Design a binder for this molecule. Structure first.
Ligand SMILES: *[C@@H]1O[C@H](CO)[C@@H](O[C@@H]2O[C@H](CO)[C@@H](O[C@@H]3O[C@H](CO[C@H]4O[C@H](CO)[C@@H](O)[C@H](O)[C@@H]4O)[C@@H](O)[C@H](O[C@H]4O[C@H](CO)[C@@H](O)[C@H](O)[C@@H]4O)[C@@H]3O)[C@H](O)[C@H]2NC(C)=O)[C@H](O)[C@H]1NC(C)=O
Ligand SMILES: *[C@@H]1O[C@H](CO)[C@@H](O[C@@H]2O[C@H](CO)[C@@H](O)[C@H](O)[C@H]2NC(C)=O)[C@H](O)[C@H]1NC(C)=O
Ligand SMILES: *[C@@H]1O[C@H](CO)[C@@H](O)[C@H](O)[C@H]1NC(C)=O
Ligand SMILES: O=C(O)[C@@H]1NC[C@H](O)[C@@H](O)[C@@H]1O
Length: 595
């Protein structure tokens, strides 16, 4: 008996906030070419689909009274160039200087350091930019994640105050949260619980004032292979904080390491394919629907981050918890690195197509209503037209997922009933679909027999499996209703996209860059910020040697790899957007390429 998915496009319920646009990693480096390509891939997720890169040990990128901010400057500039912000964990020993936070002199030093860098980058990027950054405490303080730094309970509070007072000294508009830990039942997690007690009731190291600013409470809760388990753990902790610290009742809670499984490096075959990709969306669905959709209890939940920006290492290029697949091709002159877009990362661009309002949606199987705590679920959105640039949109993301278990031998019949689409000019819909059969670069890698140093052609073939299967813009039936009967696989993802034709064509592509990969092979990357619409089919890429179009299959991801048959890559590249109604936008400024 089929699953029935119902969407009412006229019933725009409440604000839908894109609360999941974050990633992270821990260095074992961050300036290496590998890492440069990685963040080019992250920033390429369309429509600002990933905003924050929560980076450990950022204050080991600074040497030592004055400091060398050269390495930190480089990483942050790198982030900036890919339209990303750091999850700025005030974490590190400033290359070995700081050792004890019960040393009164060291607490003062740390304050002045924090003020120093904060002011530095306000001058570098502007207060309007830096104010968006989530400054954070040392990651997992209860896990003894300290190196040679001594950090007792008392020391952690001194540390915190200095972080707080130092940031304030730069500017009061700068946000600060913590502790970034798990919050297990007392006497467990003393430093995490101790922090809240201090912020709530203790006195400020510097000002002697009762109460210390705490802008958000971040925690780490992981699902141990269960998607709903994450949400369950969050409720328990969040309620314990509502009742124990009544001042923090409205304080936003982040979960900046909300992963299905602890241990990023541990190889898992589900991490390789759409199994991960579907489960990540299930978590986001579970969160939106079963927590943030006016379910009278509404805890202030603002951020979910998947700590999955790590780079893979051999012999596990796909199986690790990473957005991209790394290949260290060691047998060319010289050795060069190549990255592949895993299903999860492709899906972060599917999620990205959702808009500011949630629509009413219901999933049932033969009468019985099923919430997102089931193998199938849906997130539906609608958009209120801003300028002449955009028009009305509906984003319907349906998922099929049994968590960390895949089922290749089963097919899931679904009937989508869409109703109540506000009438308007040239309404069309576009399906986008991902499964392990049709969209697994890991799948292709294995068809090609697991080459360790893939060739150009092997790399072309593996790449062809990144983008989801799409169908040409078909006009919507009259009445503002659509009925489809897709046969979904387990796992899969299906995004039906309904768009009305806006007044003016799309905006101009900007910030175009060419990035060398190897002989006769490069990365083209850009930005959609000035495009101002989500109703896009593909990006036209033209090449000049003296312009003719690079004939490629459709893709809206803001990153393309040019690996042509001729080996000819030197010349000039321009890029423009193409919408669902065949309309061209303005070409970006041409970018030259010398090899
Ligand atoms: C092409 O050439 C590149 C270098 O140019 C090679 O890349 C190296 O690949 C190996 C992968 O085997 C890497 O070594 C591995 O590092 C892992 C973690 O690195 C850091 O993190 C841990 C803890 O977080 C630290 O302890 C460590 O000091 C590092 O800072 C380790 O987990 C791996 O050890 C595990 O596997 C080995 C088997 O390989 C077991 O013996 C161990 O017991 C353990 O389970 C491993 O040491 C290495 O970092 C890479 N170097 C670089 C510069 O990238 C490629 O190997 C090469 N390609 C081919 C095909 O050979
Ligand atoms: C999500 O669904 C599962 C059912 O699969 C719920 O788990 C059950 O919870 C009840 C509590 O009333 C237990 O007695 C059962 O033993 C659980 N069932 C199984 C199969 O383990 C879970 O609580 C649901 N969670 C949410 C947040 O709705
Ligand atoms: C800081 O360190 C970098 C990299 O090690 C070095 O090149 C640079 O000269 C240093 N800058 C200053 C001002 O000392
Ligand atoms: O779960 C992990 O693998 C790691 N745990 C410890 C670190 O906090 C985090 O960066 C990683 O996600």
């Amino acid at each position: 008996a089929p699953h029935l998915v119902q969407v009412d496009a006229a019933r725009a319920l409440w604000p839908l906030r894109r609360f999941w646009r974050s990633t992270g990693f821990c260095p074992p480096y961050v300036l290496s070419w590998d890492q440069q390509l990685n963040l080019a891939y992250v920033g390429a997720v369309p429509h600002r689909g990933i905003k924050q890169v929560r980076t450990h040990w950022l204050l080991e990128l600074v040497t030592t009274l004055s400091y060398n901010f050269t390495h930190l400057d480089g990483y942050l500039d790198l982030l900036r160039e890919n339209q990303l912000l750091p999850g700025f964990e005030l974490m590190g020993s400033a290359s070995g200087h700081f050792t004890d936070f019960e040393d009164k002199q060291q607490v003062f030093e740390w304050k002045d350091l924090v003020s120093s860098l904060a002011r530095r980058y306000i001058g570098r990027y502007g207060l309007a930019h830096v104010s968006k950054w989530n400054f954070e405490t040392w990651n997992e303080p209860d896990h003894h994640d300290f190196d040679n730094v001594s950090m007792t309970m008392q020391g952690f509070l001194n540390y915190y105050d200095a972080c707080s007072e130092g940031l304030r000294a730069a500017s009061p508009a700068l946000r600060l949260g913590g502790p970034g830990d798990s919050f297990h039942t007392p006497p467990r997690s003393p430093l995490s619980w101790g922090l809240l007690r201090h912020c709530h009731d203790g006195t400020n190291f510097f000002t002697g004032e009762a109460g210390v600013r705490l802008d958000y409470i971040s925690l780490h809760r992981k699902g141990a292979r269960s998607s709903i388990s994450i949400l369950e753990q969050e409720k328990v902790v969040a309620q314990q904080i509502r009742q124990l610290f009544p001042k923090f009742a409205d304080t936003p809670i982040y979960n900046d390491e909300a992963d299905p499984l602890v241990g990023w490096s541990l190889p898992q075959p589900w991490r390789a394919d759409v199994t991960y990709a579907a489960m990540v969306v299930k978590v986001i669905a579970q969160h939106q629907n079963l927590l943030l959709a006016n379910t009278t209890s509404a805890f202030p939940y603002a951020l979910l981050s998947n700590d999955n920006a790590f780079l893979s290492y051999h012999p596990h290029p796909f199986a690790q918890r990473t957005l991209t697949a790394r290949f260290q091709v060691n047998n060319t002159r010289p050795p060069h690195v190549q990255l592949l877009r895993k299903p999860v990362l492709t899906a972060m661009g599917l999620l990205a197509l959702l808009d500011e309002e949630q629509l009413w949606a219901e999933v049932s199987q033969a009468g019985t209503v099923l919430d997102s705590n089931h193998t199938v679920g849906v997130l539906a959105s609608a958009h209120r037209p801003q300028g002449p640039a955009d028009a009305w949109r509906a984003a319907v993301l349906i998922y099929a997922s049994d968590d960390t278990r895949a089922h290749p031998n089963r097919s899931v019949a679904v009937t989508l009933r869409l109703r109540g689409v506000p009438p308007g000019p040239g309404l069309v819909y576009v399906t986008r679909y991902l499964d392990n059969g049709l969209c697994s670069p890991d799948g292709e890698w294995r068809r090609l027999g697991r080459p360790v140093f893939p060739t150009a052609e092997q790399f072309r073939r593996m790449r062809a499996a990144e983008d989801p299967v799409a169908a040409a813009p078909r006009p919507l039936p009259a009445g503002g209703r659509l009925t489809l009967r897709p046969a979904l696989r387990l796992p899969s993802l299906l995004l039906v996209h309904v768009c009305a034709r806006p007044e003016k064509p799309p905006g101009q592509v900007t910030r175009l860059r060419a990035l060398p990969l190897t002989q006769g092979q490069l990365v083209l990357v850009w930005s959609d910020e000035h495009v101002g619409s989500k109703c896009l089919w593909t990006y036209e890429i033209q090449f000049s040697q003296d312009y003719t179009p690079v004939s490629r299959k459709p893709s809206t991801f803001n990153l393309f790899v040019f690996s042509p048959d001729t080996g000819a890559v030197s010349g000039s590249y321009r890029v423009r957007a193409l919408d669902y109604w065949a309309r061209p936008g303005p070409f970006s400024d041409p970018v030259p390429y010398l090899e």
